Structure formats: C-alpha cells, structure tokens
Amino acid sequence: VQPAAWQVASLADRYEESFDIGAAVEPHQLNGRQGKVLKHHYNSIVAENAMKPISLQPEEGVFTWDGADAIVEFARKNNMNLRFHTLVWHNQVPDWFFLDEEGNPMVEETNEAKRQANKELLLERLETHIKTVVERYKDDVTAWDVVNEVVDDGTPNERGLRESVWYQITGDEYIRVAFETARKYAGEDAKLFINDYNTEVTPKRDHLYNLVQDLLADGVPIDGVGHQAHIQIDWPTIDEIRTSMEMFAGLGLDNQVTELDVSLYGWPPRPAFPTYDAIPQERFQAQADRYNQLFELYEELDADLSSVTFWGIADNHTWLDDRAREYNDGVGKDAPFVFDPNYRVKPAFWRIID
Numbered sequence: 013v014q015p016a017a018w019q020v021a022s023l024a025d026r027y028e029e030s031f032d033i034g035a036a037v038e039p040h041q042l043n044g045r046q047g048k049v050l051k052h053h054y055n056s057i058v059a060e061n062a063m064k065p066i067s068l069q070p071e072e073g074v075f076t077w078d079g080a081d082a083i084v085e086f087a088r089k090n091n092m093n094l095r096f097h098t099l100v101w102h103n104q105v106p107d108w109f110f111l112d113e114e115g116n117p118m119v120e121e122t123n124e125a126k127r128q129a130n131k132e133l134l135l136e137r138l139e140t141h142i143k144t145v146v147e148r149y150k151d152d153v154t155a156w157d158v159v160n161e162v163v164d165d166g167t168p169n170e171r172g173l174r175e176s177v178w179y180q181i182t183g184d185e186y187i188r189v190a191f192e193t194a195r196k197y198a199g200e201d202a203k204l205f206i207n208d209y210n211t212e213v214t215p216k217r218d219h220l221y222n223l224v225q226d227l228l229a230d231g232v233p234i235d236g237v238g239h240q241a242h243i244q245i246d247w248p249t250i251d252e253i254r255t256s257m258e259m260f261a262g263l264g265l266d267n268q269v270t271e272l273d274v275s276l277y278g279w280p281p282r283p284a285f286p287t288y289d290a291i292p293q294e295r296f297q298a299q300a301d302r303y304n305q306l307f308e309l310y311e312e313l314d315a316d317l318s319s320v321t322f323w324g325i326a327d328n329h330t331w332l333d334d335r336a337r338e339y340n341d342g343v344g345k346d347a348p349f350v351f352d353p354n355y356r357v358k359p360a361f362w363r364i365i366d
C-alpha cells in the first residue's frame with residue numbers, strides 16, 4: 013500500500029542541484045490531484061498538446077490562445093520553468109499551411125517554378141507563425157522546441173532528414189528559418205532546442221549530430237538537443253543514452269530529456285495487459301530497476317543535462333495507452349511513470365528518490 017505522491021519527498025527538491033523535474037500537462041489537469049502533484053514534485057511543465065501548431069493557429073490569422081495561456085498562467089503562478097512544445101512539426105499542424113493560392117496541396121505541384129513559389133509562401137507562413145507565438149510567450153518560456161522530429165529514422169537524403177511536407181516543400185530551409193526566427197523574436201538568451209525521439213541510436217543520432225554541426229558551422233542558432241526518451245525497460249541501453257547526450261555536450265550543446273516515459277512493453281507494445289490491475293508486480297519491478305539506472309545516469313551526466321521532463325504526470329494519463337490500445341485490439345494499459353493511476357507512488361519512485 014503505497015502513499016499518495018504529495019506525501020513523499022519532492023523530486024524537484026531531490027534533483028534541484030542536478031536538473032529541473034518536468035511534466036507534460038493539459039489545461040484540465042492544472043487543478044485537483046494532478047495540480048497538487050505538479051506543485052509538489054515539479055518545477056517545470058510543457059504543454060502536451062495546447063502549443064502545437066494546430067492548437068495555436070487552426071486557420072490562417074486565427075490564433076486560439078486559451079489553453080496555452082492557462083498553462084502559462086499556471087507556470088507563472090507556481091514559479092515553474094516552461095518548455096515550449098513545439099513551433100514546427102509534421103503532425104498536429106494545420107492543413108492550410110501547405111496549400112497553394114488555389115487550394116491545392118503544394119506537394120502535388122509538378123512545375124519547378126510554382127514549387128519555388130510554394131517554398132517562399134510556406135516559409136513566410138512559418139516565419140509569421142513563429143514570430144506571433146514567440147512574441148506572446150517570450151517572457152515565460154525557458155526552453156523552446158523550435159523544431160520537432162525533422163530527422164529521419166532512415167536516410168532518404170544527403171543530410172538524413174525527414175521527407176515530411178516541410179522538407180518536400182522547402183528542403184532543409186524551414187529548419188534554418190525556424191531557428192533564426194525563434195532567436196530573432198525570443199532574444200539572445202532564449203534556449204533553442206531541436207527535439208527528437210530515438211536520439212540514442214544510430215543512424216538517427218549521427219544524422220542529428222551531423223546536422224547540428226552543419227547548422228552551427230553556418231551560424232544557425234541552436235542551444236541544445238531535446239531527447240524525447242520514449243524508452244522501454246531494456247532499450248535503449250544506458251551506454252547508448254550516455255553516448256548521445258555526451259556527444260552533443262561535446263559540441264557545447266545543452267541536453268534536455270523532454271518526453272520521458274518508460275513503457276512496460278516493447279515495440280510494438282504487444283501483449284499489453286488489459287487494465288492496470290492486471291499488470292503483474294514483476295513488471296513494476298523491472299521498471300523500477302530501469303528507472304534506478306536511468307536516474308543514476310542522469311545525475312552522473314548532470315553537468316550536461318539541465319531538465320528531465322516526463323511525458324505526463326501519473327499513469328492515469330499517457331499517450332502510451334493509445335499505442336497499447338492500437339496494437340492490442342482496442343484494450344490495453346501501459347504504466348510509464350513513478351506515480352500510479354491513483355497518484356500513489358510506485359516501486360520506481362523509491363528507486364529515484366534516494
């Protein structure tokens with residue numbers, strides 16, 4: 013019988029000399045016990061959804077600020093650092109960005125001259141998006157995910173870049189423009205990150221390594237790498253995680269762990285247990301060991317790691333459940349955090365609080 017999260021020692025306090033402790037939040041989770049857990053264990057937050065491009069500009073010139081503002085207000089009120097997630101991504105990004113002046117998808121265009129025009133139009137839209145959003149949240153955001161997931165899992169081109177709508181339309185230019193615009197409007201002091209998953213493993217790691225070396229050499233402003241750390245119990249290895257973080261630190265970049273979850277399953281996450289109560293104790297203990305080693309590593313690397321954020325708060329809310337449902341016929345429960353669905357501490361908590 014584990015105690016409630018607000019009854020144990022604060023994680024932020026335990027790691028205050030090492031790094032921020034962060035959580036991804038939705039507006040509705042800012043009160044209640046989620047609220048209470050946040051104020052007690054965390055000194056940083058990020059918007060799980062309320063700040064992605066489609067959440068902020070769903071039609072051109074129509075900005076929808078309420079959710080994001082609610083999160084800001086809460087960070088402000090509770091003296092918490094705030095990551096911005098995210099200025100550019102190829103999902104939860106609104107359709108209108110990528111349509112030509114006659115409403116057709118720019119990617120379908122076959123004329124090399126109109127494509128060039130479409131590239132100028134898209135980059136202009138991006139610049140206008142970035143400038144507006146940054147200008148509003150400039151004074152509260154302490155770290156910016158300028159771009160998210162622009163590096164490919166494979167290698168479809170020279171630079172190892174995701175051939176998303178952004179790249180198909182503009183090559184690598186949106187990346188340069190994203191950072192340069194974000195620097196421009198946020199000021200020299202703002203911390204700009206390139207955020208991604210599987211940063212721990214090659215080829216992707218090397219591509220990002222190469223890419224940030226390139227961009228830096230050309231004076232494109234980029235302060236750090238965001239390691240999503242959607243990880244599993246036995247993968248990636250501790251040595252892979254360290255090597256990625258220490259490589260990027262070698263370049264003078266900051267590292268943050270930005271969306272950490274420790275799934276009870278592999279990839280794809282099958283077989284999942286159908287409910288939390290069905291999850292055998294065995295799995296909470298393998299997770300607990302994984303967390304112990306993971307936070308041993310983080311603390312060891314704390315010279316080069318400023319923030320560790322979980323992609324959620326307690327196991328009642330986690331996108332991993334969508335994945336579990338997806339790969340197990342609509343019924344499936346994961347449990348990635350150190351607090352359970354009822355805000356009680358899990359074996360993993362004790363392993364990282366000490």
Ligand SMILES: [Mg+2]
Nearest residue numbers: 304363364366
């Ligand atoms: Mg420990």
Ligand code: NA
Nearest residue numbers: 030314317318
């Ligand atoms: Na640190």
